[PDB]
Amino acid sequence: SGFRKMAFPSGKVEGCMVQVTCGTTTLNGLWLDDVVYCPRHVICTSEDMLNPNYEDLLIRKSNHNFLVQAGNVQLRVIGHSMQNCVLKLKVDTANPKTPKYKFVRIQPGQTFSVLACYNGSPSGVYQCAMRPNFTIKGSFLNGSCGSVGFNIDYDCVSFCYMHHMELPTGVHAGTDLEGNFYGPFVDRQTAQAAGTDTTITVNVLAWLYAAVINGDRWFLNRFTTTLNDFNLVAMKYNYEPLTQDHVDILGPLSAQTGIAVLDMCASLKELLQNGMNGRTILSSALLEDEFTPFDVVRQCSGVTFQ
Amino acid sequence: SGFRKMAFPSGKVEGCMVQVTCGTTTLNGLWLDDVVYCPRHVICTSEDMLNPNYEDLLIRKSNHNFLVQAGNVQLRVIGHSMQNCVLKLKVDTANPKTPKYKFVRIQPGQTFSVLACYNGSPSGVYQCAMRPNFTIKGSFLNGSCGSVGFNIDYDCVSFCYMHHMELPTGVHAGTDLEGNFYGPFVDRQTAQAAGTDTTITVNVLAWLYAAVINGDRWFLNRFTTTLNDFNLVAMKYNYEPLTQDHVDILGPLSAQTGIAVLDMCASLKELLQNGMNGRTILSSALLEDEFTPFDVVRQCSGVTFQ
């Protein structure tokens, strides 16, 4: 029993974290087989970042201009390419610590673990949700660029996120590992508006199920609701609209706890229209939306990996 | 910028996690050099746990009765000892993946990362506080026993906690790595009362400083307070009494933000006596007490390890 925001174990990803230095700037890189992946703004200074021409800036660099360190080893760069917003540095040596891995572009609403790194050195690990507006609310200091978010299913590391910047608004934006930004953002130091954000309704429902499994039951009522009726309430409170695909994803949680999805919706509408009345759910006084239905099932059943 | 509940990277600890099976029961063990550490109730069944005589039960076992698996390797037990509530299993092979490490007994109020494991296999990692009443509010399913909490400073893994049981009340209790329980608990399946718990006041203050560093400032006031006056409020709201040792530990945070500790106290008393008024601090509507002043400084400055 008990419910926690849990990160994936970060072992397999720590062995891939390296330090990339091009002249001034140093940030983190990801060393898989014999390629190092890092944000291309490693070739920028801080004034370059106002309006950079990455094409021109990278023509000014050669293989030997990229200093890449993996702990103690200084690594040997023998080929450099630009794919969208990431730099691919070809290296002399394959990483003996390369896990089985995939590159994945995730969906808004899905979660992942971030390994925050500085100078190629892991600092700590935390769980994140990709907001509906393609930002993440992370913890990233100067030099954290190149840090990666990832999922693990048994033996495979699915890399989904690389950190590139912090918006003036304080939230964070980055790319997949092919270098395509999530959201409308660009790697330029200018004002960039994130969309209006909303709450991930299917995730709040999963968390309510997790709460029932763990004994917090006060929010359950015998009222019920329709899907279309619940969605009028969702729209009023800036919740993502619930679809039948979401109901179906909540199927196993429904079946374990014996509470139909539309009964949990009627519980949720009541929470939205009346608050918690100084009570808490799983020791929180807000509605939590960073647990997918898969996260709840893995934690409430004990799925492990390697 | 940004502030998250961050766990330590779990790489160095994953390589020590093994699976220990004695007849019926299987749980996790910790393999350092050539000794495996696990809870001694691995030699119990579920009825043994009502009132076990560990002395007698362990006399019934031999070296070859302990099946210990490290991933694929089946490990060779050649000596078994009982130290308080932990079993020490001597093994044929030293762990090539043994990190630099210490055994530490921590203080109530300190925090640590837990690597939740099942069958010797890591499931995920989260950050914990040792409550003033020596429980922890974790996420532990059946078979999670033997999981360990730990800290890391640069290259050293300081093991402080091993999980042994879940109380009927839903909270968790365990030992240091010498096998001495934290708190008044025993490894027996009986009703066991945890003390009255309280809130870790020095930690709530550290988190308020973290909030100021990150731009949340609405709770600051120009009122102030004395230490003795603040402590009357603390006692009314079941907060741990603030001492001068606590004020001194908050020194660096005080100096970074320019807010004296007693000014933050007057902010806190106001929060305690008036609530948040539907506002949030670092995206939370409760006062957070799982960040030590060291945790805040490490995250707000970027301390790394290996």
Residue numbers in the entry:
A (entry chain A), B (entry chain A): 1 to 306
Sentences from the paper on this structure:
SARS-CoV-2 Mpro is a cysteine protease that forms a dimer composed of two protomers. Each protomer comprises the chymotrypsin and 3C-like peptidase domains I and II (residues 10–99 and 100–182, respectively), with the active site consisting of a Cys145-His41 catalytic dyad located in the cleft between the two antiparallel-β-barrel domains. Mpro cleaves the polyproteins at 11 positions with a consensus cleavage sequence Leu Gln | (Ser, Ala, Gly) to release nsp’s, which are required to assemble the viral replication-transcription complex. In addition to the indispensable role in viral replication, SARS-CoV-2 Mpro also plays an essential role in escaping antiviral defense by cleaving host cell proteins.
